[PDB]
Design a binder for these strands. Structure first.
Ligand SMILES: Nc1ncnc2c1ncn2[C@H]1C[C@H](O)[C@@H](COP(=O)(O)OP(=O)(O)OP(=O)(O)O)O1
Ligand SMILES: [Mg+2]
Ligand SMILES: [Mg+2]
Ligand SMILES: [Mn+2]
Length: 758
DNA sequence: ACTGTGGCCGTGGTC
DNA sequence: GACCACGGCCAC
């Protein structure tokens, strides 16, 4: 099984390394034969003789074109003749590419920014993570001596916990009488023992939770302070701390550093992403949190360090269990994209689509278009029309069927051959013409992306079958994440068409897909309501809720299924409308916001404050209870009583602060907020107190009693002292609870005055 | 920061 | 007060 590639430099020449696991043995394979290259398109071939003479000077050594070779390739399906320029070292390509491009005979250059080791994986047809090879894994975590406002890493590490399938242990340097603690003499000894555990266990995978940004950097700093070589690489190397935008990522040569946070952050939607909150969300069970003060208070007194050791051991054990659950999903994406698990687990979905396309283009001899320059970016700025959203019917409806197209946009792309290499391709036998926007797509030959999307859909359907048949609820949920992941990837091929920085950008493709989408769903709404007696209650892009007014549950189900058998034979290609759900009762508040209840009594909520991380829990809890009373008990006065009870508790300061916290992400550097709302105001004030705030920081705040700008009374949630400050009851009533529940209860004739406390 | 557009809603800046 | 950009997050 291939894990990763890189290259090293020996005597000026690049040597590729393939890291592999085979029959239980770790192997490094060296390849000295691979030559870096890019392509130049010339005004004509006589110019190759002058183009070959372009040089560049890098660090006092002359970079030259090693060898030029004329090749025939396709570009958007059309023959093209380009010159393949070979070089003696990968660094030669960035040193020379601008000067090759500036040559007056050179129309353009291509495939000049592809990292050498990834170029090798693609060109040699190598797919990481293929095979039945069983890989060993090891999680670890650290506990540090923290005091607020010191520079990063000034405090000693106190404990290092690690866990695999067989054990979970804590290494520390103070006496804790627990069976899973190993006490050693010093912090230096603790780290050195951790290093030996990893050398001796020799895991293929190292699992952390935010190791990219905290754990490895802390260890590195302590190793520097104590004079330790931080050997974890299988080749003796230290961890390599590469930059990724505003964050970092940490590589361990010969192993896969699997940092869970990026994967968790993009898979699960939570208001905060503590390890405790993630563990609870995945496994449905609590994890205790011991805080930095509690840690420091224990360390400096000697007392109650058992709890700290327990907390550390659980960190590692939970990190391991989370790692085991999610690794198969990342391994599969790794095989689908053809890049290392280390890369795919950290990559944006945009880069994944691009890397997939680059590989497939190589197999097809399709020259890749370039990422756009600033001028082309500028001319790509226009938007385009998206999906149709029907304003919902007001009120409480019974016997609601939910119908929804399977993999709609990908299905449109394949069925209508929507691709840049088919757009307005001239002199063709057959065309599909997009409605409204008019773009013509040739059907004579399969388009590049259309030809690739099917397998993705089949891969998703294969997972979905395994899911719906899987009994164990935890495995079923992880299979649900997995099938959603392949679904999001498939739809990201559509979105890639309208992505400004995309290589195979094609706005005409993007807007053709949405245009077909609007026509299909509006045709379904029309057929249902004009011919089959349904009332469509709500509709969003490719799905719809409908009922037959006055009909019993089984009549609606029967007519809905009859409609599916009437409509689907009339749909072209892969287009299929699916029966997705039936709800005995349901309520549509506005576009994007509704709630239904199935025959088993489960309420499904969309878009309502219940669902959002940025509303307080007292607002979301109360909304949930109101919805249950209405949807499950039919009882609206209970709902009203519920609200009136909660507003009475807020007034009397009888609601606990936890339910008052608002959570909002900082999404950008603090300095380029054009407007400063509460979470930004809090952030900036923490920033001024020397706290690192960066994109992805989740601000947690509570609004104190006062008047004026909310931002002037918002404080960090952890600073709310219920004795010294009092929360702003009026704010939580009139700005949190009542807006959330009034949007529901107004349907029943209730006004806010009906809901407040005396 | 990087797959797309449609959309609701709170906050606080401008008159 | 009206007006309405900004920002966050959600449904597709
Ligand atoms: N994350 C997304 N990125 C881009 N386009 C999206 C995204 N989610 C939804 N869309 C678009 C493409 C989908 O085909 C369309 C309808 O959404 P949806 O019903 O959730 O997905 P789907 O039809 O692809 O899958 P499914 O088989 O679950 O119904 O909206
Ligand atoms: Mg849908
Ligand atoms: Mg004025
Ligand atoms: Mn769908």
């Amino acid at each position: 099984m291939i894990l990763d590639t890189d290259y090293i430099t020996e005597n000026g020449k690049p040597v590729i390394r393939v890291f592999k696991k085979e029959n239980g043995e770790f192997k490094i394979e060296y390849d000295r034969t691979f030559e870096p290259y890019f392509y130049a398109l010339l005004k004509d071939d006589s110019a190759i003789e002058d183009v070959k003479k372009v040089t560049a000077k890098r660090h006092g050594t002359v970079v030259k074109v090693k060898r030029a070779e004329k090749v025939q390739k396709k570009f958007l399906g059309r023959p093209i003749e380009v010159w393949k320029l070979y070089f003696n070292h990968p660094q030669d390509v960035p040193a020379i590419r601008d000067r090759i491009r500036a040559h007056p005979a050179v129309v353009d250059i291509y495939e000049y920014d592809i990292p050498f080791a990834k170029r090798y994986l693609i060109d040699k047809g190598l797919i990481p993570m293929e095979g039945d090879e069983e890989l060993t894994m090891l999680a670890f975590a650290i506990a540090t001596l923290y005091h607020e406002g010191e520079e990063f890493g000034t405090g000693p590490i106190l404990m290092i916990s690690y866990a695999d399938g067989s054990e979970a242990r804590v290494i520390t340097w103070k006496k804790i009488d627990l069976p899973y603690v190993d006490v050693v003499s010093t912090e230096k000894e603790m780290i050195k023992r951790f290093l030996r555990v990893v050398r001796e266990k020799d895991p293929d995978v190292l699992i952390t939770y935010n190791g990219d940004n905290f754990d490895f950097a802390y260890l590195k700093k302590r190793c520097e302070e104590l004079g330790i070589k931080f050997t974890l690489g299988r080749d003796g190397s230290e961890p390599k701390i590469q930059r990724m935008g505003d964050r970092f990522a940490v590589e361990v040569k010969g192993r896969i550093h699997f940092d869970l946070y990026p994967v968790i952050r993009r898979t699960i939607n939570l208001p905060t992403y503590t390890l405790e909150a993630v563990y609870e969300a995945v496994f449905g069970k609590p994890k205790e949190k011991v805080y930095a003060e509690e840690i420091a208070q224990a360390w400096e007194s000697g007392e109650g360090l058992e709890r700290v050791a327990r907390y550390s051991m659980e960190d590692a054990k939970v990190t391991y269990e989370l790692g085991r659950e999610f690794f198969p999903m990342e391994a599969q994406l790794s095989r689908l994209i053809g890049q290392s698990l280390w890369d795919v687990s950290r990559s944006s979905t945009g880069n994944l689509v691009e890397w997939f396309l680059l590989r497939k283009a190589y197999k097809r001899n399709e020259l890749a278009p370039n990422k756009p320059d600033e001028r082309e970016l500028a001319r790509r700025r226009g938007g385009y029309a998206g999906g149709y959203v029907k304003e919902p019917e007001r009120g409480l409806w019974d016997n609601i069927v939910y119908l929804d197209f399977r993999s709609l946009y990908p299905s449109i792309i394949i069925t209508h051959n929507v691709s840049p290499d088919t757009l307005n391709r001239e002199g063709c036998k057959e065309y599909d013409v997009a409605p409204e926007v008019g773009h013509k797509f040739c059907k004579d030959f399969p388009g590049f992306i259309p030809s690739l999307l099917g397998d993705l859909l089949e891969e998703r359907q294969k997972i979905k079958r395994k899911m719906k048949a899987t009994v164990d609820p935890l495995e079923k949920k992880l299979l649900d994440y997995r099938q959603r992941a392949i679904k999001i990837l498939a739809n990201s091929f559509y979105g890639y068409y309208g992505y400004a920085k995309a290589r195979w950008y094609c706005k005409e493709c993007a807007e053709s897909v949405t245009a077909w989408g609007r026509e299909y769903i509006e045709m379904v709404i029309r057929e249902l309501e004009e011919k089959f007696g349904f009332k469509v209650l709500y509709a969003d892009t490719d799905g719809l809720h409908a009922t037959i007014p006055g009909a019993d549950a089984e009549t609606v189900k029967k007519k809905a299924k009859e409609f599916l058998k009437y409509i689907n034979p009339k749909l072209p290609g892969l287009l299929e409308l699916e029966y997705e759900g039936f709800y005995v009762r349901g309520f549509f508040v506005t576009k994007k916001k509704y709630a239904v209840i199935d025959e088993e009594g489960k309420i499904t909520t969309r878009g309502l404050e219940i669902v959002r991380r940025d509303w307080s829990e007292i607002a979301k809890e109360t909304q949930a209870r109101v919805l249950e009373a209405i949807l499950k008990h039919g009882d609206v006065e209970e709902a009203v009583r519920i609200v009136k009870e909660v507003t009475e508790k807020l007034s009397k300061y009888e609601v606990p602060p936890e339910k008052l916290v608002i959570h909002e992400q900082i999404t950008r550097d603090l300095r380029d907020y054009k407007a400063t709302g509460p979470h930004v105001a809090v952030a900036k004030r923490l920033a001024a107190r020397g706290v690192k705030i960066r994109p992805g920081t989740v601000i947690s705040y509570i609004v104190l009693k006062g008047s004026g700008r909310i931002g002037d009374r918002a404080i960090p949630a952890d600073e709310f002292d219920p004795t010294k400050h009092r929360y702003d009851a009026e704010y939580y009533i009139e700005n949190q609870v009542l807006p959330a529940v009034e949007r529901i209860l107004k349907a029943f004739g209730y006004r806010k005055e009906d809901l407040r406390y005396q």
